[PDB]
Protein backbone atom coordinates (compact mmCIF):
# COMPACT_ATOMS: atom_id res chain seq x y z
CA UNK A 1 0.00 0.00 0.00
CA UNK A 2 1.52 3.36 -1.07
CA UNK A 3 2.13 6.47 1.03
CA UNK A 4 -0.49 8.36 -1.00
CA UNK A 5 -2.92 5.42 -0.74
CA UNK A 6 -2.53 5.63 3.08
CA UNK A 7 -3.43 9.34 3.18
CA UNK A 8 -6.51 8.59 1.05
CA UNK A 9 -7.46 5.60 3.24
CA UNK A 10 -7.00 7.72 6.39
CA UNK A 11 -9.12 10.60 5.07
CA UNK A 12 -11.90 8.25 3.90
CA UNK A 13 -11.77 6.14 7.12
CA UNK A 14 -11.53 8.82 9.84
CA UNK A 15 -12.81 12.13 8.36
CA UNK A 16 -16.55 12.81 8.49
CA UNK A 17 -18.28 15.54 6.44
CA UNK A 18 -20.11 18.29 8.40
CA UNK A 19 -23.52 16.57 7.47
CA UNK A 20 -23.25 12.98 8.74
CA UNK A 21 -21.58 11.00 5.94
CA UNK A 22 -17.93 9.79 5.86
CA UNK A 23 -15.74 11.76 3.40
CA UNK A 24 -15.41 10.20 -0.13
CA UNK A 25 -12.66 11.85 -2.21
CA UNK A 26 -13.16 12.48 -5.93
CA UNK A 27 -10.59 11.12 -8.44
CA UNK A 28 -9.01 14.57 -8.95
CA UNK A 29 -8.41 14.83 -5.19
CA UNK A 30 -7.02 11.28 -5.05
CA UNK A 31 -4.83 11.75 -8.13
CA UNK A 32 -3.41 14.93 -6.59
CA UNK A 33 -2.67 13.10 -3.31
CA UNK A 34 -1.06 10.16 -5.14
CA UNK A 35 1.11 12.51 -7.23
CA UNK A 36 2.29 14.44 -4.15
CA UNK A 37 3.05 11.51 -1.82
CA UNK A 38 4.10 8.78 -4.32
CA UNK A 39 6.48 11.09 -6.22
CA UNK A 40 9.63 8.85 -6.41
CA UNK A 41 11.71 12.03 -6.81
CA UNK A 42 10.23 13.61 -3.63
CA UNK A 43 7.80 16.56 -3.67
CA UNK A 44 8.99 19.98 -2.36
CA UNK A 45 5.93 21.94 -3.55
CA UNK A 46 2.44 20.84 -4.64
CA UNK A 47 -0.08 23.10 -6.38
CA UNK A 48 -3.73 22.15 -6.95
CA UNK A 49 -5.65 24.93 -8.69
CA UNK A 50 -9.40 24.58 -9.07
CA UNK A 51 -12.43 26.87 -9.40
CA UNK A 52 -14.25 28.02 -6.25
CA UNK A 53 -16.49 25.59 -4.32
CA UNK A 54 -14.78 22.34 -5.37
CA UNK A 55 -14.07 21.04 -1.84
CA UNK A 56 -10.85 22.95 -1.02
CA UNK A 57 -11.61 23.34 2.72
CA UNK A 58 -12.37 19.64 3.25
CA UNK A 59 -9.22 18.53 1.40
CA UNK A 60 -6.99 20.92 3.34
CA UNK A 61 -8.52 19.69 6.61
CA UNK A 62 -8.17 16.05 5.57
CA UNK A 63 -4.50 16.43 4.68
CA UNK A 64 -3.76 18.36 7.90
CA UNK A 65 -5.32 15.61 9.99
CA UNK A 66 -3.34 12.90 8.13
CA UNK A 67 -0.24 14.86 9.22
CA UNK A 68 -1.59 15.59 12.74
CA UNK A 69 -2.52 12.06 13.78
CA UNK A 70 -2.64 9.84 10.64
CA UNK A 71 0.04 8.00 8.61
CA UNK A 72 2.02 11.22 7.85
CA UNK A 73 2.39 12.11 11.55
CA UNK A 74 6.02 12.41 12.62
CA UNK A 75 7.29 13.08 16.17
CA UNK A 76 7.70 16.65 17.61
CA UNK A 77 6.75 18.65 14.49
CA UNK A 78 4.66 21.62 13.49
CA UNK A 79 2.16 21.91 10.66
CA UNK A 80 0.45 25.10 9.50
CA UNK A 81 -2.24 26.44 7.25
CA UNK A 82 -1.74 29.96 5.86
CA UNK A 83 -4.42 32.30 4.44
CA UNK A 84 -4.60 36.06 3.91
CA UNK A 85 -7.50 36.80 6.30
CA UNK A 86 -8.42 35.74 9.86
CA UNK A 87 -11.75 34.54 8.44
CA UNK A 88 -10.09 32.05 6.03
CA UNK A 89 -7.86 30.65 8.79
CA UNK A 90 -10.95 30.23 11.02
CA UNK A 91 -12.89 28.41 8.28
CA UNK A 92 -10.19 25.72 7.86
CA UNK A 93 -9.55 25.46 11.60
CA UNK A 94 -13.28 25.18 12.44
CA UNK A 95 -13.82 22.44 9.82
CA UNK A 96 -10.80 20.49 11.17
CA UNK A 97 -12.19 20.81 14.73
CA UNK A 98 -15.63 19.54 13.55
CA UNK A 99 -14.01 16.52 11.89
CA UNK A 100 -12.03 15.85 15.09
CA UNK A 101 -15.21 15.98 17.22
CA UNK A 102 -17.44 13.93 14.84
CA UNK A 103 -15.16 10.83 15.11
CA UNK A 104 -14.33 9.58 18.68
CA UNK A 105 -11.21 7.82 17.36
CA UNK A 106 -9.85 11.30 16.39
CA UNK A 107 -11.49 13.12 19.32
CA UNK A 108 -9.70 10.93 21.87
CA UNK A 109 -6.15 11.84 20.63
CA UNK A 110 -6.38 15.61 19.95
CA UNK A 111 -6.07 18.40 22.51
CA UNK A 112 -7.49 21.83 21.59
CA UNK A 113 -5.99 24.99 23.10
CA UNK A 114 -8.64 27.32 24.72
CA UNK A 115 -7.14 30.43 23.03
CA UNK A 116 -5.88 31.05 19.50
CA UNK A 117 -6.12 28.48 16.70
CA UNK A 118 -4.03 25.52 17.87
CA UNK A 119 -4.53 21.71 17.87
CA UNK A 120 -2.09 19.13 19.25
CA UNK A 121 -2.02 15.59 17.89
CA UNK A 122 -1.04 13.88 21.14
CA UNK A 123 0.49 10.51 20.02
CA UNK A 124 3.22 12.16 17.87
CA UNK A 125 3.27 15.60 19.60
CA UNK A 126 2.30 17.41 16.36
CA UNK A 127 1.35 21.09 16.78
CA UNK A 128 -1.11 22.52 14.19
CA UNK A 129 -1.52 26.32 13.94
CA UNK A 130 -4.00 28.13 11.67
CA UNK A 131 -2.20 31.25 10.49
CA UNK A 132 -3.20 34.37 8.60
CA UNK A 133 -1.39 37.41 7.23
CA UNK A 134 -3.92 39.48 9.21
CA UNK A 135 -3.22 39.49 12.97
CA UNK A 136 -0.24 38.83 15.20
CA UNK A 137 3.03 37.28 13.99
CA UNK A 138 3.25 34.00 15.97
CA UNK A 139 6.53 33.43 17.83
CA UNK A 140 7.42 29.74 17.31
CA UNK A 141 7.24 29.00 13.57
CA UNK A 142 9.05 26.03 11.96
CA UNK A 143 6.68 23.93 9.85
CA UNK A 144 7.51 20.57 8.22
CA UNK A 145 4.17 21.03 6.37
CA UNK A 146 2.57 24.29 5.30
CA UNK A 147 -0.68 24.34 3.32
CA UNK A 148 -1.22 27.77 1.72
CA UNK A 149 -4.91 28.49 1.24
CA UNK A 150 -6.15 30.72 -1.65
CA UNK A 151 -2.72 32.26 -2.42
CA UNK A 152 -4.17 33.44 -5.77
CA UNK A 153 -5.49 36.45 -3.82
CA UNK A 154 -1.90 37.83 -3.61
CA UNK A 155 -1.54 40.68 -6.15
CA UNK A 156 2.21 41.34 -6.11
CA UNK A 157 4.97 39.02 -7.27
CA UNK A 158 5.82 38.87 -3.51
CA UNK A 159 4.15 38.82 -0.06
CA UNK A 160 5.80 39.09 3.38
CA UNK A 161 3.53 36.50 5.02
CA UNK A 162 4.13 33.81 2.40
CA UNK A 163 7.90 34.45 2.55
CA UNK A 164 7.90 34.15 6.38
CA UNK A 165 6.33 30.68 6.14
CA UNK A 166 8.62 29.68 3.24
CA UNK A 167 11.72 30.92 5.07
CA UNK A 168 10.69 29.04 8.26
CA UNK A 169 10.39 25.74 6.37
CA UNK A 170 14.04 26.18 5.32
CA UNK A 171 15.14 25.01 8.78
CA UNK A 172 14.12 21.44 7.71
CA UNK A 173 15.88 19.21 5.16
CA UNK A 174 12.94 18.26 2.89
CA UNK A 175 9.72 20.06 4.00
CA UNK A 176 6.44 20.04 2.02
CA UNK A 177 4.60 23.16 0.78
CA UNK A 178 1.04 22.60 -0.55
CA UNK A 179 -0.95 25.37 -2.29
CA UNK A 180 -4.70 25.00 -2.91
CA UNK A 181 -6.21 28.02 -4.66
CA UNK A 182 -8.25 29.42 -7.50
CA UNK A 183 -5.90 31.05 -9.98
CA UNK A 184 -4.76 34.63 -9.62
CA UNK A 185 -6.55 37.03 -11.95
CA UNK A 186 -3.26 38.31 -13.36
CA UNK A 187 -0.30 36.58 -15.05
CA UNK A 188 2.02 38.83 -12.94
CA UNK A 189 0.63 37.62 -9.58
CA UNK A 190 2.53 35.31 -7.21
CA UNK A 191 0.52 32.12 -7.92
CA UNK A 192 0.69 32.57 -11.70
CA UNK A 193 4.51 32.74 -11.44
CA UNK A 194 4.59 29.55 -9.32
CA UNK A 195 2.32 27.69 -11.74
CA UNK A 196 4.18 28.92 -14.84
CA UNK A 197 7.58 27.96 -13.40
CA UNK A 198 6.30 24.45 -12.57
CA UNK A 199 4.65 24.02 -15.98
CA UNK A 200 7.63 25.31 -18.02
CA UNK A 201 10.34 23.53 -15.91
CA UNK A 202 8.48 20.21 -15.38
CA UNK A 203 10.57 20.06 -12.18
CA UNK A 204 10.34 16.49 -10.81
CA UNK A 205 10.03 17.86 -7.23
CA UNK A 206 6.97 20.00 -8.08
CA UNK A 207 3.41 18.80 -8.62
CA UNK A 208 1.02 21.21 -10.34
CA UNK A 209 -2.51 20.16 -11.25
CA UNK A 210 -4.43 23.08 -12.75
CA UNK A 211 -8.09 22.67 -13.71
CA UNK A 212 -9.15 25.56 -15.99
CA UNK A 213 -11.49 26.20 -18.91
CA UNK A 214 -9.48 26.98 -22.12
CA UNK A 215 -9.31 30.67 -23.16
CA UNK A 216 -11.61 30.43 -26.21
CA UNK A 217 -14.13 28.06 -24.53
CA UNK A 218 -17.85 28.91 -24.45
CA UNK A 219 -18.68 30.10 -20.92
CA UNK A 220 -22.22 28.64 -21.12
CA UNK A 221 -21.18 25.04 -22.01
CA UNK A 222 -21.01 22.24 -19.43
CA UNK A 223 -17.63 20.95 -20.70
CA UNK A 224 -16.11 24.37 -19.95
CA UNK A 225 -17.53 24.10 -16.41
CA UNK A 226 -16.22 20.55 -15.85
CA UNK A 227 -12.71 21.59 -16.98
CA UNK A 228 -12.48 24.14 -14.13
CA UNK A 229 -14.82 22.44 -11.63
CA UNK A 230 -13.72 18.79 -11.39
CA UNK A 231 -16.21 18.27 -8.51
CA UNK A 232 -19.19 19.22 -10.76
CA UNK A 233 -22.15 17.24 -9.40
CA UNK A 234 -20.47 16.06 -6.14
CA UNK A 235 -19.17 19.10 -4.17
CA UNK A 236 -19.94 21.79 -6.80
CA UNK A 237 -23.59 22.47 -7.64
CA UNK A 238 -24.27 22.41 -11.38
CA UNK A 239 -27.47 24.39 -10.68
CA UNK A 240 -25.29 27.14 -9.15
CA UNK A 241 -22.76 27.08 -12.05
CA UNK A 242 -25.69 27.49 -14.48
CA UNK A 243 -27.00 30.51 -12.55
CA UNK A 244 -23.50 32.11 -12.44
CA UNK A 245 -22.94 31.39 -16.17
CA UNK A 246 -26.26 33.07 -17.06
CA UNK A 247 -25.40 36.07 -14.86
CA UNK A 248 -22.02 36.35 -16.64
CA UNK A 249 -23.93 36.32 -19.96
CA UNK A 250 -26.41 39.05 -18.91
CA UNK A 251 -23.83 41.19 -16.95
CA UNK A 252 -20.61 41.90 -18.92
CA UNK A 253 -19.12 43.51 -15.76
CA UNK A 254 -19.45 40.09 -13.99
CA UNK A 255 -17.82 38.03 -16.80
CA UNK A 256 -14.26 38.43 -15.46
CA UNK A 257 -15.35 37.37 -11.96
CA UNK A 258 -17.10 34.32 -13.46
CA UNK A 259 -14.05 33.51 -15.59
CA UNK A 260 -11.63 33.77 -12.64
CA UNK A 261 -13.70 32.26 -9.80
CA UNK A 262 -15.78 29.68 -11.69
CA UNK A 263 -13.72 28.87 -14.83
CA UNK A 264 -10.34 29.20 -13.01
CA UNK A 265 -8.93 31.44 -15.78
CA UNK A 266 -6.55 34.35 -15.61
CA UNK A 267 -8.26 37.47 -17.01
CA UNK A 268 -5.01 39.14 -18.12
CA UNK A 269 -3.34 38.33 -21.46
CA UNK A 270 0.29 37.71 -22.39
CA UNK A 271 2.26 38.14 -25.59
CA UNK A 272 5.77 38.86 -26.83
CA UNK A 273 6.79 42.53 -26.79
CA UNK A 274 8.55 42.63 -30.17
CA UNK A 275 9.78 40.48 -33.06
CA UNK A 276 13.52 40.57 -33.86
CA UNK A 277 12.75 41.73 -37.41
CA UNK A 278 10.77 44.79 -36.19
CA UNK A 279 13.42 45.57 -33.54
CA UNK A 280 16.25 45.36 -36.15
CA UNK A 281 14.57 48.09 -38.25
CA UNK A 282 15.36 50.60 -35.44
CA UNK A 283 19.06 49.59 -35.26
CA UNK A 284 20.75 52.58 -36.97
CA UNK A 285 23.34 54.04 -34.56
CA UNK A 286 22.12 56.78 -32.17
CA UNK A 287 23.43 60.38 -32.24
CA UNK A 288 24.01 62.70 -29.25
CA UNK A 289 22.92 66.25 -30.17
CA UNK A 290 21.45 68.86 -27.75
CA UNK A 291 17.81 68.15 -26.79
CA UNK A 292 15.61 67.26 -23.81
CA UNK A 293 17.24 64.01 -22.60
CA UNK A 294 15.19 61.68 -20.35
CA UNK A 295 16.65 58.86 -18.26
CA UNK A 296 15.21 55.60 -16.94
CA UNK A 297 17.06 53.65 -14.25
CA UNK A 298 16.22 50.06 -13.16
CA UNK A 299 18.44 48.73 -10.35
CA UNK A 300 15.80 46.14 -9.19
CA UNK A 301 17.54 42.88 -10.26
CA UNK A 302 20.52 43.42 -7.91
CA UNK A 303 21.91 39.85 -8.43
CA UNK A 304 21.39 39.60 -12.24
CA UNK A 305 21.29 42.79 -14.41
CA UNK A 306 20.87 46.53 -13.69
CA UNK A 307 20.19 49.10 -16.47
CA UNK A 308 20.21 52.84 -17.25
CA UNK A 309 18.64 54.18 -20.46
CA UNK A 310 18.98 57.78 -21.63
CA UNK A 311 16.65 58.69 -24.52
CA UNK A 312 15.46 61.84 -26.28
CA UNK A 313 13.69 63.08 -29.40
CA UNK A 314 15.91 64.48 -32.19
CA UNK A 315 14.99 67.38 -34.55
CA UNK A 316 13.55 64.75 -36.92
CA UNK A 317 10.83 62.56 -35.32
CA UNK A 318 13.27 59.98 -34.00
CA UNK A 319 14.33 58.92 -30.49
CA UNK A 320 18.00 58.15 -29.83
CA UNK A 321 18.53 55.51 -27.14
CA UNK A 322 21.76 55.03 -25.19
CA UNK A 323 21.74 52.07 -22.78
CA UNK A 324 24.30 51.27 -20.04
CA UNK A 325 24.29 48.03 -18.03
CA UNK A 326 25.78 46.80 -14.73
CA UNK A 327 26.23 43.20 -13.52
CA UNK A 328 27.99 41.52 -10.55
CA UNK A 329 31.62 40.40 -11.21
CA UNK A 330 31.76 37.30 -8.94
CA UNK A 331 28.71 35.66 -10.55
CA UNK A 332 29.71 36.58 -14.17
CA UNK A 333 31.02 33.16 -15.28
CA UNK A 334 28.16 31.35 -13.51
CA UNK A 335 25.44 33.59 -15.05
CA UNK A 336 26.95 33.37 -18.57
CA UNK A 337 26.27 29.61 -18.42
CA UNK A 338 22.96 29.82 -16.48
CA UNK A 339 21.35 32.45 -18.75
CA UNK A 340 23.04 31.27 -22.00
CA UNK A 341 24.09 34.83 -22.85
CA UNK A 342 27.64 35.95 -23.73
CA UNK A 343 28.08 38.33 -20.75
CA UNK A 344 31.84 37.55 -20.67
CA UNK A 345 32.28 38.77 -24.27
CA UNK A 346 30.18 41.90 -23.64
CA UNK A 347 32.07 42.93 -20.47
CA UNK A 348 35.32 42.36 -22.40
CA UNK A 349 33.96 44.45 -25.33
CA UNK A 350 32.97 47.38 -23.02
CA UNK A 351 29.22 46.94 -23.75
CA UNK A 352 28.47 45.61 -20.24
CA UNK A 353 30.03 46.91 -17.00
CA UNK A 354 30.79 45.08 -13.73
CA UNK A 355 30.53 45.80 -10.02
CA UNK A 356 32.57 43.76 -7.48
CA UNK A 357 30.74 41.05 -5.49
CA UNK A 358 27.56 38.99 -6.04
CA UNK A 359 25.28 42.07 -5.73
CA UNK A 360 25.28 45.31 -7.75
CA UNK A 361 27.03 47.92 -5.57
CA UNK A 362 25.01 51.20 -5.76
CA UNK A 363 28.20 53.19 -4.98
CA UNK A 364 29.87 51.94 -8.18
CA UNK A 365 26.74 52.53 -10.32
CA UNK A 366 26.37 56.21 -9.27
CA UNK A 367 30.11 56.83 -9.82
CA UNK A 368 29.82 55.66 -13.47
CA UNK A 369 26.57 57.60 -14.01
CA UNK A 370 28.47 60.77 -13.02
CA UNK A 371 30.95 60.04 -15.84
CA UNK A 372 28.06 59.07 -18.20
CA UNK A 373 25.89 62.18 -17.60
CA UNK A 374 28.93 64.32 -18.47
CA UNK A 375 27.71 63.92 -22.08
CA UNK A 376 23.95 64.40 -21.24
CA UNK A 377 22.00 67.30 -19.72
CA UNK A 378 19.13 65.25 -18.27
CA UNK A 379 15.66 66.78 -17.83
CA UNK A 380 14.36 63.88 -15.67
CA UNK A 381 15.43 60.42 -14.44
CA UNK A 382 12.57 57.97 -13.84
CA UNK A 383 13.02 55.67 -10.83
CA UNK A 384 11.03 53.30 -8.61
CA UNK A 385 8.57 55.44 -6.55
CA UNK A 386 9.07 53.31 -3.40
CA UNK A 387 12.94 53.46 -3.37
CA UNK A 388 13.56 57.05 -4.60
CA UNK A 389 14.75 58.65 -1.31
CA UNK A 390 17.28 55.84 -0.64
CA UNK A 391 18.81 56.28 -4.12
CA UNK A 392 18.67 60.13 -3.88
CA UNK A 393 20.61 59.96 -0.58
CA UNK A 394 23.27 57.59 -2.04
CA UNK A 395 23.66 59.76 -5.19
CA UNK A 396 23.90 63.00 -3.13
CA UNK A 397 26.48 61.26 -0.88
CA UNK A 398 28.94 61.06 -3.85
CA UNK A 399 28.33 64.69 -4.94
CA UNK A 400 25.96 63.70 -7.80
CA UNK A 401 22.62 65.50 -8.18
CA UNK A 402 20.09 63.73 -10.41
CA UNK A 403 16.68 65.11 -11.43
CA UNK A 404 14.82 62.09 -10.01
CA UNK A 405 11.11 61.69 -10.77
CA UNK A 406 9.00 58.91 -9.17
CA UNK A 407 7.88 56.16 -11.56
CA UNK A 408 5.54 53.31 -10.62
CA UNK A 409 6.57 49.74 -11.49
CA UNK A 410 2.96 48.48 -11.65
CA UNK A 411 0.35 48.40 -14.38
CA UNK A 412 -1.03 51.95 -13.89
CA UNK A 413 2.27 53.80 -14.54
CA UNK A 414 3.81 51.35 -17.07
CA UNK A 415 0.64 51.08 -19.16
CA UNK A 416 0.93 54.38 -21.08
CA UNK A 417 4.75 54.21 -21.36
CA UNK A 418 4.65 50.75 -22.96
CA UNK A 419 2.00 52.02 -25.45
CA UNK A 420 4.20 55.01 -26.35
CA UNK A 421 7.33 52.87 -26.77
CA UNK A 422 5.44 50.36 -28.90
CA UNK A 423 4.05 53.17 -31.09
CA UNK A 424 7.60 54.59 -31.66
CA UNK A 425 9.04 51.16 -32.61
CA UNK A 426 6.12 50.56 -35.01
CA UNK A 427 6.81 53.71 -37.11
CA UNK A 428 10.64 53.39 -37.05
CA UNK A 429 11.16 56.37 -34.68
CA UNK A 430 13.98 54.83 -32.59
CA UNK A 431 17.74 54.61 -33.12
CA UNK A 432 19.30 52.00 -30.77
CA UNK A 433 22.37 50.92 -32.82
CA UNK A 434 21.75 47.19 -32.31
CA UNK A 435 23.23 47.35 -28.78
CA UNK A 436 23.57 43.58 -28.06
CA UNK A 437 22.51 43.70 -24.40
CA UNK A 438 19.41 45.87 -25.00
CA UNK A 439 18.59 43.69 -28.01
CA UNK A 440 18.75 40.58 -25.79
CA UNK A 441 16.28 42.29 -23.41
CA UNK A 442 13.94 43.29 -26.30
CA UNK A 443 13.84 39.78 -27.77
CA UNK A 444 13.29 38.19 -24.31
CA UNK A 445 10.55 40.71 -23.36
CA UNK A 446 6.99 39.54 -22.75
CA UNK A 447 4.12 41.98 -22.05
CA UNK A 448 1.26 41.24 -19.63
CA UNK A 449 -1.97 43.17 -20.27
CA UNK A 450 -4.39 43.51 -17.33
CA UNK A 451 -8.19 43.43 -17.59
CA UNK A 452 -8.36 47.27 -17.80
CA UNK A 453 -6.01 47.36 -20.86
CA UNK A 454 -2.82 48.42 -18.98
CA UNK A 455 0.36 46.76 -20.30
CA UNK A 456 3.62 46.01 -18.56
CA UNK A 457 6.80 44.04 -19.08
CA UNK A 458 7.24 40.93 -16.93
CA UNK A 459 10.62 39.62 -15.74
CA UNK A 460 9.11 36.33 -14.45
CA UNK A 461 7.25 35.47 -17.71
CA UNK A 462 10.37 36.20 -19.76
CA UNK A 463 13.11 33.57 -20.24
CA UNK A 464 16.37 35.54 -19.83
CA UNK A 465 16.87 39.14 -18.73
CA UNK A 466 14.66 42.09 -19.81
CA UNK A 467 15.84 44.88 -17.48
CA UNK A 468 17.08 47.19 -20.28
CA UNK A 469 13.50 47.28 -21.64
CA UNK A 470 12.08 48.31 -18.26
CA UNK A 471 14.57 51.20 -18.11
CA UNK A 472 13.83 52.06 -21.78
CA UNK A 473 10.07 52.09 -21.02
CA UNK A 474 10.59 54.37 -17.98
CA UNK A 475 12.85 56.63 -20.08
CA UNK A 476 10.15 57.07 -22.74
CA UNK A 477 7.48 57.33 -20.00
CA UNK A 478 9.26 60.27 -18.35
CA UNK A 479 7.93 62.45 -21.24
BR1 LIG B 1 -6.81 5.16 -3.87
BR1 LIG C 1 -16.67 32.06 -4.08
BR1 LIG D 1 -14.04 27.61 -1.92
BR1 LIG E 1 0.52 3.81 8.92
BR1 LIG F 1 3.56 15.70 11.43
BR1 LIG G 1 -16.68 28.40 10.14
BR1 LIG H 1 -5.24 33.69 12.83
BR1 LIG I 1 1.85 34.67 11.35
BR1 LIG J 1 -11.65 31.45 0.09
BR1 LIG K 1 12.25 26.63 -16.97
BR1 LIG L 1 -21.40 24.29 -4.13
BR1 LIG M 1 -2.92 34.89 -22.95
BR1 LIG N 1 21.99 65.99 -15.29
BR1 LIG O 1 19.67 67.57 -10.46
BR1 LIG P 1 2.23 51.79 -10.76
BR1 LIG Q 1 2.79 58.02 -29.08
BR1 LIG R 1 -6.10 41.66 -14.19
Residue numbers in the entry: 1 to 18, 23 to 483
Study authors write:
A large number of double-stranded DNA viruses, including tailed bacteriophages and herpes viruses, use a homomeric ring ATPase to processively translocate viral genomic DNA into procapsids during assembly. By contrast, pac systems feature imprecise, sequence-independent cleavage of the DNA concatemer during head filling, giving rise to variable genome lengths inside virus particles. Both systems encode a large terminase (TerL) protein, composed of a viral packaging ATPase domain and a nuclease domain, and a small terminase (TerS) protein, which recognises the cos or pac site between genome copies and, upon binding of DNA, recruits TerL to make an initiating DNA cut. Here, we reconstituted in vitro a cos packaging system based on bacteriophage HK97 and provided a detailed biochemical and structural description. Crystal structures of the large terminase and DNA-recruiting small terminase, a first for a biochemically defined cos system, reveal mechanistic similarities between cos and pac systems.
To gain structural insights into the active ATPase of the HK97 system, we determined the crystal structure of the apo HK97 TerL at 2.2 Å resolution. The structure comprises both ATPase and nuclease domains, with the two connected by a short linker and a unique β-strand (red) that is absent in pac TerL proteins. This unique β-strand forms a three-stranded β-sheet with the auxiliary hairpin of the nuclease domain (beige). An additional ααβ element was observed within the nuclease domain relative to pac TerL proteins (blue), possibly serving as a platform for interactions with HNH endonuclease GP74 or simply part of an adaptation of cos TerL proteins towards sequence-specific endonuclease activity. The ATPase core comprises an eight-stranded β-sheet, with six parallel strands and two anti-parallel strands, a topology that is conserved across viral packaging ATPases, which build on the ASCE 51432 topology. The Walker A motif is found between strands β1 and β2. Unlike in lambda gpA, a lysine residue, K60, occurs at the expected position; however, like in lambda, a second lysine residue, K57, occurs N-terminal to the classical position. The Walker B motif resides at the end of strand β6 with catalytic residues D153 and E154. The HK97 TerL nuclease domain has an RNase H-like fold, with residues D302, D388 and D471 at the catalytic center. Residue K463, which follows the hairpin, protrudes into the active site, forming potential salt bridges with D302 and D471 and coordinating a water molecule.
